[PDB]
Amino acid sequence: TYVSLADLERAARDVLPGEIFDFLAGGSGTEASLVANRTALERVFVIPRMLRDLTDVTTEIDIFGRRAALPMAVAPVAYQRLFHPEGELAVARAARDAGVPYTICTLSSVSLEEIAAVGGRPWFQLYWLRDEKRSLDLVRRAEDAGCEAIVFTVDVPWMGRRLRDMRNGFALPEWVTAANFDEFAPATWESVEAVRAHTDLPVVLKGILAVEDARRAVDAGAGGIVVSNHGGRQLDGAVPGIEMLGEIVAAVSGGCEVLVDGGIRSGGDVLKATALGASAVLVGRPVMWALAAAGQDGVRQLLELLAEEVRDAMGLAGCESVGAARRLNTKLGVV
Amino acid sequence: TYVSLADLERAARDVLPGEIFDFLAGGSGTEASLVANRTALERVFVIPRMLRDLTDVTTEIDIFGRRAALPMAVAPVAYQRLFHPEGELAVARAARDAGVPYTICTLSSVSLEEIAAVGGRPWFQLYWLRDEKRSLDLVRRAEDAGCEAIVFTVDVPWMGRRLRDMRNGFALPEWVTAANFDEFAPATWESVEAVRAHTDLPVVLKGILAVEDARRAVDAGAGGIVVSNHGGRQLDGAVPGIEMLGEIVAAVSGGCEVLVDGGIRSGGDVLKATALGASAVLVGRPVMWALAAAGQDGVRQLLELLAEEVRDAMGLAGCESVGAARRLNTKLGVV
Amino acid sequence: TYVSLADLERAARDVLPGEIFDFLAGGSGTEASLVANRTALERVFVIPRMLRDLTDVTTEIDIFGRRAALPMAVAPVAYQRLFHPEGELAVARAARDAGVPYTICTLSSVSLEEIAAVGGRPWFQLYWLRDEKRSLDLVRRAEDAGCEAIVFTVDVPWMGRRLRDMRNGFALPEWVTAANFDEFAPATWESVEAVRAHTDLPVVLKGILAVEDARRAVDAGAGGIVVSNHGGRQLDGAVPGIEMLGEIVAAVSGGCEVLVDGGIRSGGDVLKATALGASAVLVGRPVMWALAAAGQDGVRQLLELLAEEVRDAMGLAGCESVGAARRLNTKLGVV
Amino acid sequence: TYVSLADLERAARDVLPGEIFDFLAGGSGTEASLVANRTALERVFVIPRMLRDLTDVTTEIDIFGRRAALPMAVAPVAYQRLFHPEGELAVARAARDAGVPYTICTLSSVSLEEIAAVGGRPWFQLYWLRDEKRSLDLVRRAEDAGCEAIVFTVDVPWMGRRLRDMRNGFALPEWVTAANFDEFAPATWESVEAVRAHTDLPVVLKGILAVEDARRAVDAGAGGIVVSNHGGRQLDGAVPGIEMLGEIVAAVSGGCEVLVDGGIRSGGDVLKATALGASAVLVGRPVMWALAAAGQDGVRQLLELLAEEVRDAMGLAGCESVGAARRLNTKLGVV
Ligand SMILES: Cc1cc2nc3c(=O)[nH]c(=O)nc-3n(C[C@H](O)[C@H](O)[C@H](O)COP(=O)(O)O)c2cc1C
Ligand SMILES: Cc1cc2nc3c(=O)[nH]c(=O)nc-3n(C[C@H](O)[C@H](O)[C@H](O)COP(=O)(O)O)c2cc1C
Ligand SMILES: Cc1cc2nc3c(=O)[nH]c(=O)nc-3n(C[C@H](O)[C@H](O)[C@H](O)COP(=O)(O)O)c2cc1C
Ligand SMILES: Cc1cc2nc3c(=O)[nH]c(=O)nc-3n(C[C@H](O)[C@H](O)[C@H](O)COP(=O)(O)O)c2cc1C
Ligand SMILES: O=C(O)C(=O)c1ccccc1
Ligand SMILES: O=C(O)C(=O)c1ccccc1
Ligand SMILES: O=C(O)C(=O)c1ccccc1
Ligand SMILES: O=C(O)C(=O)c1ccccc1
Ligand SMILES: O=C(O)C(=O)c1ccccc1
Ligand SMILES: O=C(O)C(=O)c1ccccc1
Ligand SMILES: O=C(O)C(=O)c1ccccc1
Ligand SMILES: O=C(O)C(=O)c1ccccc1
Ligand SMILES: [Mg+2]
Ligand SMILES: [Mg+2]
Ligand SMILES: [Mg+2]
Ligand SMILES: [Mg+2]
């Protein structure tokens, strides 16, 4: 019984140890950017269209060479065994079954090859290592295992200052490890070029907020970008991605896929992102709430709920396809 | 003893079963659009004019070929026997006596012919059925019974997701039925044309928010539109009608009547809507509060209160007629 | 011991009967315009100037042919014996001693001739009567008694709907009467012309909010206007005067004095009004708080406090005169 | 254990007598300008850049002929022995050790020569005295003692009205004195010229908010300005410096250093100020919190925390230098 994504947060709040809930929920500094992701979405109103043909409403998109059932993918979230014993396998299985891409993390608590074996056409998120050769060996592993895109996270030259974790003195339980390993260095545009030169997979730069970085990403050969302030966990005071999305979509003028994340908590939010020009969204914390609450079945229920909310919102707004939703206009309101 | 519309909500809160109060009060999703209808009105301030001749102040308008006592009609609200045993008959009698149009619903709990027999020059609200022939037979029934406009609701390809109702497990009591029947399909512009071709009554499209849909409505032969997000019950995140009204009035440039609804709770709110260019408003939930609180006499008291508030507001703003009120300027403020 | 105007409200709250405090404090309808007077002032920030010569700072102005000690006058407030037994005489004595104009009301609870006999160069506020001849006889009385301006209130074709008073069932105590009498009709521009033709005193139109009404006031021969929504007691939803002031000052381009009222509660507020272009302000409710709290001495303390706050604010903003303060720039902020 | 500047306020709240905490925390009037300093910063969001070279991130700047370790100095705060027995010596020692300039006050509770003897290349803040000769003798003392800039405070023709202090009846303890003395007059542009003519040190005008005063400061030969409303302690209703900073930086077009203060409470806030164009910031109240909480070691911990936060924010925003941070763009958001 879940009728909104908020039902699942309460459930995850119930079950998780406090420090782990804080690791999941928290942001950096004063959490201004964390709160702003929600504020910014709540200010956006859609102008729906009426009286359109809705006899074949579809929420499917084509992205990075594959069909997805929704304009959504599961965001990279490290160490998912923190939230449930089956960790990444539970989430990847539910995503596969829902037809949603799953992003395998560099810091996954189950090896990328095991998660890829689940099936479901997965993506791989890269954090840049120490030396180019080991970074590229991670990319090669992912490609060999059947991952279909490399999501290179570019907003973490180092990790942000998460004060909840500092106050809690939070550290990984001994029962959770970085399963892809037996160290990290800041990524640069040179790093992006090294990755692009080493793979035929589309490279997606996650954590772009400046318009000129979006243009440079296209010039650098990126197949996509994720407009994102990393869920408010990196620079405290970084603008929400949803506030830069329209400008960025106009600037790249179809040169790559433009995704957005941060605070997506309903099908209506997905519609807002689409109306502002996103190709698709990522969803992070809610997927972990569902995982914590009820494992694989929990994530299944979440994705079924989001699928019904996206269909509902699209139809009510007169959109028989995600392309139509991208042509919707919006208006900024107050509170 | 009621000196504001808020007095009646408290009274209805007293008497109604909780689940029924929630069916009435609620919106879809997070109720963002429900709240925004009120927020948007509260941001609007009127710039009143002084020292005008007020020796013959009149709140009357001519609309769809008939005089109305106020620039207001009772909004379509389904299943009014949910709120009082006399249901639609109580409300239609009070509206008749007040000189206000009453909108008979497709999903009325008393048959449209019985309600029309009350008198008072009624309108009929259409939800599109299954097959064109039965939809048109409903329109023909309404016209035969003396209804004077067809209010075609165009923002309900299907019903919105009302989470209060889901959580309550709300369903119609066995003692409430759709009295016009012994099934629904999404309306399209083709449906509008079928209705327009089948009746001489003015067709009014209720649920228009996009400027180009307002233009297309005029091109399609509509006699009016209602700028409306369906009281925040349909797309959660849909812009309030009051925020689109000025743009829409400019775009149709007198080509049809432009009504607005959503959150009208006083004569001052009616004045704001008029100043932004509306021909008239619809009022929904407050009429049901009055019905729940005190039946026909309750609705009578509500309409008398609104009549005095509209006269008061118009005179204080220097307007001897509703046309003068439409020429008032406004200024947006904060909170 | 009062260091702010807020100290006096608490004191008046202590002493007054509840219904009388509500008559004083309240506004019309939902009190949106009452609250907005304060909101609007709080959004205004001054850009102060530094390093100016302040060796002869003066808060004096010349207005309607006379020097005033501050750019402020006591607003017309009817029936002041409601708040203290000495009523208008206490307030007029304190105003005289402070060098501030006092506005004698048509509905004063002490006769205008008695209040004028106090001295201090008083103004007279006119509500339009029944027939022109009696209205003009009131004006002639005021002029004969030595009043120096006629403040014609133009935003009261009838009194607003004050819901606190309705709920309280408030009426005048038998011990309070309209002392100028032993009936009212809406004023029009014809009424203004009748007054202008009948007196050599400057005519000041109180309750102007529309820019074209301000222009028309100058064309009609007004010596001043008060930009005002009547303390939020008339049209609920009327824009605050402070929000129209700049536009209006630009439109009259020195053709008459432009005063403002509504929510002035400190010397800093006086500075804001001046910086937006006002010649002077009126202050209403705070004067009655002081009267209720401590009679004549209370009003004296209030005016001494406001005088020190105005001097303080002007000097801190680099203004040696009120003219300099009118040349200050402002910036709108949030909350 | 301090992970934010807010940790230290709580600690100082613990230890200080209430009246002294109020002297430190308070502002003038209604404290509107005090609150607005924080509001204004919270509305600013940074647009970070990604994938830059961060192999030599440095937070150092050159200002007034000397290297500073951070783009920050300790603001002038009078009478620091109010907060800890070692007063100014504790703060100046910690600032020296951190490589941050310390501003010695005219109203210091330890003599300027003693504080300068601590070392660390100090600045001297001037309040204009009585007669030019004694003002200039203070400047000469400062220069003889090795101070490296004269921070002439120009927004205090007299002290603001601090209502907390009035209500508390706050006065200096007998154990705190103005140690530079054994009287004050408003400064003017003539005063600035007298100082400029009498010293070779850069003269920095603290308390500039108007764009034309910033231009005039450059024309007057100032080496810098501090855009500031004096922590909301002077004119209540004065615009926050952070709201004028961008305009002012554009207007002086490199003609002098432009500093800002008011509400800086984190390294992220320093980044915002830099992105809006500031050369550096001043920090006032937080330094006194640290002093009250733990003396010299407390101020050391505060400056170490701010240093780590500034480095963190700069790197996360892709800035290897403060110059790069000044080229960041910003976007205004809500709440
Ligand atoms: C606990 C947690 C761990 C995360 N780990 C990663 C990661 O390893 N790599 C990455 O690129 N983003 C990571 N993110 C950021 C997410 O991918 C996403 O950008 C962010 O959560 C915003 O989306 P949301 O509001 O839907 O959570 C993490 C976020 C959270 C909350
Ligand atoms: C309980 C309820 C039932 C409604 N039923 C209908 C309906 O059958 N047809 C329709 O077009 N609108 C229906 N509406 C929408 C109203 O006509 C109106 O658009 C909405 O209530 C906004 O106005 P308000 O804020 O004054 O309630 C209904 C609204 C409510 C609350
Ligand atoms: C109790 C009360 C009585 C008033 N009586 C009059 C009146 O007789 N004539 C008039 O022009 N305004 C009258 N006013 C309006 C004031 O002159 C003034 O416009 C208003 O109070 C706004 O100022 P404030 O916020 O400083 O109170 C009255 C206001 C109050 C609160
Ligand atoms: C207790 C206190 C004393 C101050 N004394 C002085 C002073 O003597 N000279 C001066 O120019 N500013 C003085 N200031 C203002 C500060 O230099 C600074 O402009 C202000 O505190 C804003 O910064 P903040 O928000 O970081 O405190 C004082 C501020 C405080 C709170
Ligand atoms: O990447 C992140 O968002 C962050 O939550 C994180 C923190 C530690 C390890 C891995 C990821
Ligand atoms: O040193 C770090 O902050 C480390 O946690 C990290 C992780 C991923 C990318 C860069 C750094
Ligand atoms: O139309 C509506 O607004 C809605 O409240 C409704 C729900 C069920 C049946 C009829 C109307
Ligand atoms: O299937 C529905 O949602 C049904 O309730 C309905 C009612 C009116 C119009 C369209 C659909
Ligand atoms: O004029 C007014 O503002 C109002 O308060 C009033 C009400 C009754 C009598 C006189 C004035
Ligand atoms: O009839 C009224 O509202 C009356 O109170 C009045 C008072 C002053 C001016 C106009 C009307
Ligand atoms: O300058 C100030 O900000 C103020 O706090 C002050 C008050 C008294 C003495 C010295 C400074
Ligand atoms: O008289 C004053 O306000 C005095 O405290 C002062 C202090 C510094 C500068 C100017 C005045
Ligand atoms: Mg998201
Ligand atoms: Mg309505
Ligand atoms: Mg006032
Ligand atoms: Mg500061």
Question: Cα–Cα distance between B245 and B278 in angstroms, integer?
Answer: 7
Question: Cα–Cα distance between A308 and D4 in angstroms, integer?
Answer: 43
Which atom number of ligand 10 is nearest to the Cα of residue C186? 10
**For D199-223, b where at least 16 C-beta lie within 10 A, e where not — what string?**
bebbbbbbbbbbbebbbbbbebebb
Q: What are phi and psi of D59, to 5 degrees?
A: -95, 5
- Tokens found for residue C169: 């069932």
Experimental determination technique: X-ray
- Listed residue (B245, B198, B238, B204) closest to B221, CA to CA: B204
- Listed residue (B312, B324, B2) closest to C233, CA to CA: B312
Other C-beta atoms closer than 10 Å to the C-beta of C220 total 17
- Pure H helices in A201-316: 211-219, 241-252, 267-275, 285-316
C-alpha pair distances (Å), A49 with each of A42, A271, B228: 20, 13, 12
- Pure H helices in A87-131: 87-98, 112-117
Contact C272, D237 (CB under 8 A): yes
Residue C178 Rama label (left phi>0; alpha psi -120 to 50; beta): beta
Q: What are phi and psi of D242, to 5 degrees?
A: -60, -25
Contact C45 D166 (CB under 8 A): no
Contact B45 C29 (CB under 8 A): no
Amino acid identity of B197?
Answer: A
Q: Which residues are B281's β-sheet partners?
A: B72, B260
Question: Cα–Cα distance between D172 and D162 in angstroms, integer?
Answer: 14
Which atom number of ligand 5 is nearest to the Cα of residue A127? 1
How many residues are recorded in chain B?
A: 335
Q: How many CB pairs under 8 A join A and D?
A: 99
Question: B84, B121, B164, B230: which is the annotated catalytic residue?
Answer: B230
Site to probe by mutation for ligand 9, drawn from C156, C176, C233, C261 as the one with most ligand atoms within 8 Å of Cβ, is C233
- Listed residue (A61, A46, A13, A8) closest to A281, CA to CA: A61
Question: Cα–Cα distance between B195 and B153 in angstroms, integer?
Answer: 12
Which atom number of ligand 5 is nearest to the Cα of residue A79? 10
Question: Cα–Cα distance between A164 and A173 in angstroms, integer?
Answer: 17
Contact A45 B237 (CB under 8 A): yes
Residues 6+ apart with CB under 8 A from A10: none
Q: What are phi and psi of A227, to 5 degrees?
A: -80, 115
Contact D298, D290 (CB under 8 A): yes
Q: How far does Cα D232 stand from its chain's mean position? A: 13
Residues 6+ apart with CB under 8 A from C100: C68, C69, C70, C72, C73, C74, C303
- Known binding-site residues of C for FMN equal 125, 153, 206, 261-265, 284-285
User: CA of C259 to nearest chain B CA: how many angstroms apart?
Assistant: 17
- Tokens found for residue C199: 């007196």
Nearest residue on chain D to C271, alpha-carbon basis: D237
Question: D230, D234, D243, D300: which is the annotated catalytic residue?
Answer: D230
Question: Cα–Cα distance between B283 and B268 in angstroms, integer?
Answer: 13
Cα-only R_g, chain B:
19
Q: How far does Cα C220 stand from its chain's mean position? A: 22
- Listed residue (B163, B157, B156) closest to B29, CA to CA: B163
Amino acid identity of B225?
Answer: I
Q: What are phi and psi of C134, to 5 degrees?
A: -75, -35
- Tokens found for residue C223: 């010596």
Mutate to test the interface with D, among A235, A242, A244, A332 (most CBs of D within 10 A): A235
C-alpha pair distances (Å), A320 with each of A73, A317, B187, C64: 20, 9, 14, 69
Amino acid identity of A335?
Answer: V
How close is the Cα of D307 to the center of ligand 5, in Å?
23
Question: Cα–Cα distance between B16 and A331 in angstroms, integer?
Answer: 36
> A251 at the D interface (CB within 8 A)?
no
Measured over all CA atoms, what is the biggest interatomic distance in chain A, rounded to whole angstroms? Answer: 59
Residue D267 Rama label (left phi>0; alpha psi -120 to 50; beta): alpha
Q: Within 13 Å and on the Cβ side, how many CA atoms surround A65? A: 11
**DSSP characters for B211-240?**
HHHHHHHHHTT-SEEEE--GGGTSSTTBPP
- Tokens found for residue D192: 């600035």
User: CA of C155 to nearest chain B CA: how many angstroms apart?
Assistant: 6
**DSSP characters for A38-95?**
HHHHHTEEEE---S---TT----EEETTEEESSSEEEPP-S-GGGT-TTHHHHHHHHH
For CA atoms D38, D39, D43, D44, give the dihedral sign: negative
CATH superfamily label, B5-327: Aldolase class I (3.20.20.70)
- Listed residue (A271, A220, A225) closest to A249, CA to CA: A225
B10 appears as a binding residue in the annotation: no
- Listed residue (D327, D310, D53, D70) closest to A157, CA to CA: D53
- Tokens found for residue A153: 């996270």
Residues 6+ apart with CB under 8 A from B16: B24, B83, B292
Contacts of B167 in chain A (CB under 8 A): 3
Question: Cα–Cα distance between A20 and A33 in angstroms, integer?
Answer: 20
Q: What is the dihedral of CA C274, C278, C280, C284, to 10 degrees?
A: -100
Contact B4 C29 (CB under 8 A): yes
Question: Cα–Cα distance between D296 and D287 in angstroms, integer?
Answer: 10
Residues 6+ apart with CB under 8 A from A137: none
Task: Identify which of B39, B154, B186 has the shortest CB distance to residue A335.
Answer: B39
- Listed residue (A3, A46, A118) closest to A273, CA to CA: A46
Q: Within 13 Å and on the Cβ side, how many CA atoms surround B156? A: 21
Q: Would you say the CB of residue B15 lies under 6 angstroms from ligand 8?
A: no
Contact D275, D269 (CB under 8 A): no
Q: Which residues are A62's β-sheet partners?
A: A67
Measured over all CA atoms, what is the biggest interatomic distance in chain B, rounded to whole angstroms? Answer: 59
The yes-or-no answer on residue B230 being catalytic is yes
Residue nearest to atom 11 of ligand 10 (CA): C158
> B48 at the C interface (CB within 8 A)?
yes
Touching status, chains A and C (3+ beta-carbon pairs under 8 Å): no
- Listed residue (C301, C281, C268, C266) closest to C6, CA to CA: C266
Protein residues placing their CB within 5 Å of the ion ligand 13: A 261, 264, 283
Q: After which residues is chain B broken (C to N over 2.5 A)?
A: 182
Subunit partners of chain A (3 or more CB pairs within 8 A): B, D
User: CA of A43 to nearest chain B CA: how many angstroms apart?
Assistant: 9
Question: Cα–Cα distance between A216 and B269 in angstroms, integer?
Answer: 50
Subunit partners of chain B (3 or more CB pairs within 8 A): A, C
How close is the Cα of A78 to the center of ligand 5, in Å?
6
Q: Which helix (H) or strand (E) holds D300?
A: helix D285-316
- Tokens found for residue A29: 């500094």
Nearest residue on chain D to C41, alpha-carbon basis: D237
C-alpha pair distances (Å), C119 with each of C94, C95, C101, C136, D236: 11, 10, 10, 23, 35
Question: C84, C164, C230, C300: which is the annotated catalytic residue?
Answer: C230
C-alpha pair distances (Å), B5 with each of B24, B309, C25: 15, 10, 22
B127 appears as a binding residue in the annotation: yes
For CA atoms D249, D254, D260, D265, give the dihedral sign: positive
> A205 at the D interface (CB within 8 A)?
yes
Residue A11 DSSP label: H
- Tokens found for residue D224: 């810098």
Question: Cα–Cα distance between C167 and C19 in angstroms, integer?
Answer: 10
Contact A175, A145 (CB under 8 A): no
Question: Cα–Cα distance between B205 and B220 in angstroms, integer?
Answer: 10
Contact B49, B318 (CB under 8 A): yes
Q: How far does Cα D219 stand from its chain's mean position? A: 23
Contact A315 B158 (CB under 8 A): yes
Helix (H, G, I), strand (E, B) or coil at A297: helix
- Listed residue (C288, C303, C261) closest to C70, CA to CA: C303
Helices (H) and strands (E) in chain A, counts: 13, 12
- Listed residue (D144, D148, D157, D155) closest to D122, CA to CA: D148
C-alpha pair distances (Å), A201 with each of A253, A257, B240: 22, 14, 44
Residue B102 DSSP label: B
Which atom number of ligand 4 is nearest to the Cα of residue D263? 25
Contact C186, C158 (CB under 8 A): yes
Cα-only R_g, chain D:
19
- Listed residue (D12, D32, D1, D13) closest to D238, CA to CA: D32
